[PDB]
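Technical annex B. To support the medicinal chemistry partners, we prepared a structural model of the target in complex with MTN, based solely on the information shown next.
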Amino acid sequence: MNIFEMLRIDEGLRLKIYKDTEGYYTIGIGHLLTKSPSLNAAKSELDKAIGRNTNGVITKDEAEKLFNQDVDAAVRGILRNAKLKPVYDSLDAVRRAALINMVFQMGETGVAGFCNSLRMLQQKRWDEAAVNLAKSRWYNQTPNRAKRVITTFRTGTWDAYKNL
Ligand SMILES: *SCC1=CC(C)(C)N(O)C1(C)C
């Protein structure tokens, strides 16, 4: 297991534009196109992202290319963020993957405001951090995924993704 395999489990793979759990047009392995309700707007984003006129359908290789860019961007975003970089740097590689997963899902600003949980993670108070992380819109709206990410933070193991 690694961050790519973990996010591939959590995000799926679909090669046609679809709406994500928040109702937003997405494609590939969790590549958010736009929060606009216009499908045309989403197609335009997709064509810009891929570099050709797609009319809403991509290949598996294209989905993987966007996915690699999005994982890289999440990590780069963490390392440029004054609230996230210290916690990220304090973590082991498995827990770093859990933080990348959260930033991939909800964005840098979104995770950087989990300040109390970030402090508990910096403190390596893992059970406390897990309890605090669940007191969130994130957990309530995507509880199975959040439970997997939280288990990863609590244990520093991949047990929540074993058998997935
Ligand atoms: S998100 C910034 C932050 C707030 C507080 C909970 C005081 N912290 O310990 C850090 C710096 C994580």
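Notes passed to the chemistry partners:
The chain has one domain: 1-164.
The pocket of MTN is lined by residues 83, 112, 115-116, 118-119 (CB under 6 Å).
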